[PDB]
Scaffold this active site. Structure first.
Site, short mmCIF file in Angstrom:
data_model
loop_
_atom_site.label_atom_id
_atom_site.label_comp_id
_atom_site.label_asym_id
_atom_site.label_seq_id
_atom_site.Cartn_x
_atom_site.Cartn_y
_atom_site.Cartn_z
CD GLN A 19 71.21 68.00 25.06
OE1 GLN A 19 71.68 67.21 24.23
NE2 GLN A 19 70.62 67.60 26.18
CB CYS A 25 69.39 64.30 24.22
SG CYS A 25 68.97 63.05 25.44
CG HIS A 162 72.86 61.76 24.66
ND1 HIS A 162 72.08 62.87 24.84
CD2 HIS A 162 73.78 62.10 23.73
CE1 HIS A 162 72.59 63.87 24.14
NE2 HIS A 162 73.61 63.43 23.46
CG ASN A 182 75.73 64.92 20.90
OD1 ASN A 182 74.60 64.88 21.36
ND2 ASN A 182 76.82 64.65 21.64
O1 B95 Z 1 66.04 62.00 27.56
C1 B95 Z 1 67.00 61.26 27.39
C2 B95 Z 1 66.89 60.22 26.33
O2 B95 Z 1 67.96 59.32 26.41
C3 B95 Z 1 67.64 58.03 26.72
C4 B95 Z 1 67.91 57.55 27.99
C5 B95 Z 1 67.59 56.23 28.27
C6 B95 Z 1 66.99 55.39 27.33
C7 B95 Z 1 66.73 55.88 26.06
C8 B95 Z 1 67.04 57.21 25.77
BR1 B95 Z 1 66.60 57.88 24.06
N1 B95 Z 1 68.11 61.35 28.14
C9 B95 Z 1 68.33 62.42 29.11
C10 B95 Z 1 67.74 62.15 30.48
C11 B95 Z 1 68.36 60.90 31.02
N2 B95 Z 1 69.58 60.83 31.62
C12 B95 Z 1 69.79 59.55 31.99
C13 B95 Z 1 70.87 58.95 32.65
C14 B95 Z 1 70.80 57.59 32.87
C15 B95 Z 1 69.69 56.85 32.48
C16 B95 Z 1 68.62 57.46 31.84
C17 B95 Z 1 68.67 58.83 31.60
N3 B95 Z 1 67.80 59.67 31.00
#
Ligand code: B95
Length: 215
Positions: A19, A25, A162, A182
């Site tokens: 990524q 992700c 993630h 991953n």
């Molecule tokens: O794009 C995603 C998808 O991952 C999830 C994240 C939250 C819920 C479900 C999923 Br699937 N993650 C990368 C961007 C990001 N960093 C974070 C750090 C802390 C909180 C939320 C956050 N979001």
């Protein structure tokens, strides 16, 4: 359900991807899930396009994050169920800059009609996966930044952050585990995978499990 399942052994999982410096992700998780379902639905294993989602799905937020469930709804409601091939819509966001959406000129590589969201229960997720294939999941991966192999038993399980892909499990091992793909290249973990203990909600793995419906 069987004691152990590994959809990699079925040839159903594409190579581990990269990524890069982009919070995409969610797209790798959703698209990896579609890739596996498309193979299981009787088609050659085909790499599909994360960039389509990152650039074009305006319900989600590109390199700033997203949800697999929203990605699946976007594909069906806004893109006629079509998921483009990786080769026709290749990944361009590794340095953190997602190109603007392009609507023209791509090749459809898979079609979906919907998705399922599974109960928040590891046993039911595993039973579904055993029959139907890999499952997209949200995890807390905050504590994955030192993992070099083995079964993780002390995953920090506080906040989903993630998207990843369950591809199997092993209930017979001394510590039962999930096998997770991953998107951090094959140079992290066990050739790009992590095993986390199964049955204790490690990394919040049960909370947001989904899979596309090909059709
Ligand atoms: O794009 C995603 C998808 O991952 C999830 C994240 C939250 C819920 C479900 C999923 Br699937 N993650 C990368 C961007 C990001 N960093 C974070 C750090 C802390 C909180 C939320 C956050 N979001």
């Amino acid at each position: 359900a069987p004691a152990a399942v590994d959809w990699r052994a079925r040839g159903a999982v594409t190579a581990v991807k990269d990524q890069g410096q982009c919070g995409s992700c969610w797209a790798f998780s959703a698209i990896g899930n579609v890739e596996c379902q498309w193979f299981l639905a009787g088609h050659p294993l085909t790499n599909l396009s994360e960039q389509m989602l990152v650039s074009c799905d305006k319900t989600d937020s590109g390199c700033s994050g997203g949800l697999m469930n929203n990605a699946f709804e976007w594909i069906v409601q806004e893109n006629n169920g079509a998921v483009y091939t990786e080769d026709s819509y290749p990944y361009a966001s590794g340095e953190g800059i997602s190109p603007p959406c392009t609507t023209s000129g791509h090749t459809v590589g898979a079609t979906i009609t919907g998705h399922v969201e599974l109960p928040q229960d590891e046993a039911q997720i595993a039973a579904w996966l055993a029959v139907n294939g890999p499952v997209a999941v949200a995890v807390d991966a905050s504590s994955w930044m030192t993992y070099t192999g083995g079964v993780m038993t002390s995953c920090v399980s506080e906040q989903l952050d993630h998207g990843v892909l369950l591809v199997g499990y092993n209930d017979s091992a001394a510590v039962p585990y999930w096998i997770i793909k991953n998107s951090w290249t094959t140079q992290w973990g066990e050739e790009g995978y992590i095993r986390i203990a199964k049955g204790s909600n490690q990394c919040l793995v049960k909370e947001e499990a989904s899979s596309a419906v090909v059709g």
